[PDB]
């Protein structure tokens, strides 16, 4: 009799690399490099028409962001301004701090402003056809008695968390607008803690017309640690805070600017979430979560069967 | 492979064997047949699954890192951030390349090894009752019906039963 020993083979073999050979066919292999994303980021908070900065200021249309908490803030390219024209001298730094902090927890505070009128509004910032303003900000103007006395107010921090105060300075278009709004000319703001300060002198002049306004507001911020305190000092043009945002001690979040629409996935890339079954990935060097490691190869086949020897 | 069975003294694989990775083909008085060997098949599969278990579904969590794309020229610090990331990627790309080349060489060698072990085990079973024809086939020097072939495949073959018949056939003129 005859007894033959043997092994299987397949018609559809796969080429793999080994130590001694660039191209050897095995019966089966599996891919070790993840090369695709489904194009969506599967805790996300969609800013929709509000970028993270008007979100923080509380512009019209941003109320849906109140109380929001996120791992990744999704900021949209088609976001638009809906309020009084503004700029932020260190724009990208403020945007970083808000995004990294990862929540909009606002704590209202009562500021005992003196003599001056509060809650100034504007046609550039309409809410349901009524003149309005940033709902986190408080536009101070002169009294009906044409008075704007020096403001001198203090907020002490003996909570157990650092406070973020966002405040601004208004730049009128003309001397008339300056006096009509704040009496005094020039205005001036100084905001300070024990160890830091910011001082701003308004700059009067014509800027391009935006929503019917030639003036601008420049926004600033102050962080107040526990055991520190903040002092607001003004003879005009202050856009006052209505309180502060809470800062997490540990800041672990970030922001992603994309038009891609919003599932469950542990690994996030700017291209979208990717499966993490594979040890490596070729999608993006930027990742968040339990992710395969980024490599330069587009493919890496691991043999999962014997050498394929047909005939 | 380093043992010289697969793509070696075994000329080619069997596409018609779809119930196992290794097996037996026989020809006797009752006909020609094929049967898979489950133990050697499973031994190879277990080792490959062991490799997969080390590689599949074991990624590591990273959260806040450094920036890796830049919109403005900055010089020194940005040069350093870019260089750090480029260094890291090249070292991981190396690790990945070597891992696959090494595991694959080993997978091809372990599967060749399992084939060789099955052949060696079968050879010892047959004792003086058969001769190796050099192509993975044994010439069995006695009448071996289906149950006899089956006894070889399942490790119950008693060589003493056939030894006299086999020796007379092997050693003659």
């Amino acid at each position: 009799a005859t007894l033959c020993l043997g092994h299987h083979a397949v018609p559809n073999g796969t080429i793999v690399k080994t130590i001694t050979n660039d191209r050897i066919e095995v019966t089966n292999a599996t891919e070790l490099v993840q090369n695709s994303s489904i194009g969506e980021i599967c805790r996300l908070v969609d800013g929709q028409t509000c970028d993270i900065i008007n979100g923080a200021l509380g512009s019209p249309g941003c109320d849906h962001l109140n109380g929001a908490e996120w791992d990744v803030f999704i900021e949209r390219p088609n976001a638009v301004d809906t309020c009084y024209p503004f700029d932020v001298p260190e724009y990208q730094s403020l945007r970083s701090i808000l995004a990294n902090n990862g929540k909009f927890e606002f704590i209202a505070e009562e500021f005992q402003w003196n003599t001056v009128k509060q809650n100034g509004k504007s046609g550039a910032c309409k809410r349901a056809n009524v003149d309005d303003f940033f709902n986190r900000l408080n536009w101070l103007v002169k009294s009906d008695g044409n008075a704007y006395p020096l403001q001198n107010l203090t907020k002490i921090n003996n909570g157990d968390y650092a406070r973020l105060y966002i405040w601004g300075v208004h730049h009128p278009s003309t001397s008339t607008e300056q006096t009509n709004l704040y009496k005094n000319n020039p205005g001036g703001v100084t905001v300070s803690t024990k160890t830091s300060q910011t001082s701003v002198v308004p700059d009067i002049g014509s800027r391009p017309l935006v929503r019917e306004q030639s003036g601008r507001v420049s926004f600033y911020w102050t962080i107040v640690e526990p055991g520190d305190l903040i002092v607001f000092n003004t003879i005009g043009n202050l856009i006052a805070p209505r309180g502060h945002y809470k800062l997490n001690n540990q800041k672990k979040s970030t922001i992603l600017n994309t038009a891609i629409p919003i599932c469950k996935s542990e690994c996030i890339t700017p291209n979208g979430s990717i499966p993490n079954d594979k040890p490596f990935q070729n999608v993006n060097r930027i990742t968040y979560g339990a992710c395969p490691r980024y490599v330069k190869h587009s493919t890496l086949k691991l043999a999962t069967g014997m050498r394929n020897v047909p005939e | 492979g380093i043992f010289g069975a697969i793509a070696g003294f075994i000329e080619n694989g069997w596409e018609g064997m779809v119930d196992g990775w290794y097996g037996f083909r026989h020809q006797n008085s009752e006909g020609r047949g094929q049967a898979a060997d489950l133990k050697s098949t499973q031994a190879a599969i277990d080792q490959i699954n062991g490799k997969l278990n080390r590689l599949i579904g074991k990624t590591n969590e990273k959260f806040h890192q450094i920036e890796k794309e830049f919109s403005e020229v900055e010089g020194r610090i940005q040069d350093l951030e870019k260089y750090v990331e480029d260094t890291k990627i090249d070292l991981w790309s190396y690790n990945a390349e070597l891992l696959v080349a090494l595991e694959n060489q080993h997978t091809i060698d372990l599967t060749d090894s399992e084939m060789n072990k099955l052949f060696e085990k079968t050879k010892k079973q047959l004792r003086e009752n058969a001769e190796d024809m050099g192509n993975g086939c044994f010439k069995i020097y006695h009448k071996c019906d289906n149950a006899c072939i089956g006894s070889i495949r399942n490790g119950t073959y008693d060589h003493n039963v056939y030894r006299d018949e086999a020796l007379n056939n092997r050693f003659q003129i």
Partner: antibody, heavy 131, light 107 residues
Framework: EVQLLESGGGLVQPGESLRVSCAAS????????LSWVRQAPGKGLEWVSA????????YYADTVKGRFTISRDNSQTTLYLQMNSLRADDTATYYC????????????????????????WGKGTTVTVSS | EIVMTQSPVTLSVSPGETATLSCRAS??????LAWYQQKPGQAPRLLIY???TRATDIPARFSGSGSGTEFTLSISSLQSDDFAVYYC?????????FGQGTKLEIR
């Protein structure tokens, strides 16, 4: 529907044998693995053994390493478990449980993937070992 | 040969609150880890497998996480019918082991 039904069990004197059947009915083509898990009222779960393909398991817990033996009859689609040399602590509600593995494992459909999780549990058969 | 210890033995959680469970495991284990919901007088039911991947057609309030040694199981929105006992298994040592069990209470 992937339900299985456990038959047999009952009261036995310590030292005797008893085999429990598990009629694997439904979606299970019975090229997938099956397992036995026992639980005594007043105690938690404990994995007993497993079966794969044909004779690939051979997988028994250390408590029953030399006593229990697992049979599989794919022709009649029934899983067995011969419990010999039963002791007092063997009194438990023996559950027959399905076994599933991640699709990356289980290369050959018949053989054992050494990483299984039980998804579909059975009704269970109570076995009491006393005097 | 690889012991599993759940903590605590029993926990009391008001309905609606999130109940976090523990499944500490000696020696490393990541690939395979399955959670179960064994209601009294019934067979165990698979909830999560691997570590975080939940079973088919089970509520999204059952969350799973963990790595290597420490593993957790959190039930988001709790219901009065969740008074079951929960267990966790592991790979592999060619010998799977179960957990001790965590009793969940609901006034």
């Amino acid at each position: 529907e992937v339900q299985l039904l456990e038959s047999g069990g009952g009261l036995v004197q310590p030292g005797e044998s008893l085999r429990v059947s598990c009629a694997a009915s439904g979606f299970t083509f019975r090229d997938s693995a099956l397992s036995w898990v026992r639980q005594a009222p007043g105690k938690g779960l404990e994995w007993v053994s497993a079966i794969s393909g044909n004779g690939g398991a051979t997988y028994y817990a250390d408590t029953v390493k030399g006593r229990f033996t697992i049979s599989r009859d794919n022709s009649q689609t029934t899983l067995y478990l011969q419990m010999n040399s039963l002791r007092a602590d063997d009194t438990a509600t023996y559950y027959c449980a399905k076994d599933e593995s991640p699709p990356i494992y289980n290369l050959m459909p018949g053989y054992y993937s050494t990483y299984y999780y039980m998804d579909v549990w059975g009704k269970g058969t109570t076995v009491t070992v006393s005097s | 040969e690889i012991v599993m210890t759940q903590s605590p033995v029993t926990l009391s959680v008001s309905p609606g609150e999130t109940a976090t469970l523990s499944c500490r495991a000696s020696q490393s284990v990541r690939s395979n880890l399955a959670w179960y919901q064994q209601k009294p007088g019934q067979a165990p039911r698979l909830l999560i497998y691997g570590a975080s991947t939940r079973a088919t057609d089970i509520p999204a309030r059952f969350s799973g996480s963990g790595s290597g040694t420490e593993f957790t199981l959190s039930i988001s929105s709790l219901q009065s019918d969740d008074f079951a006992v929960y267990y966790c298994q592991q790979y592999n040592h060619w010998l799977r082991t179960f957990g001790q069990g965590t009793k969940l209470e609901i006034r």
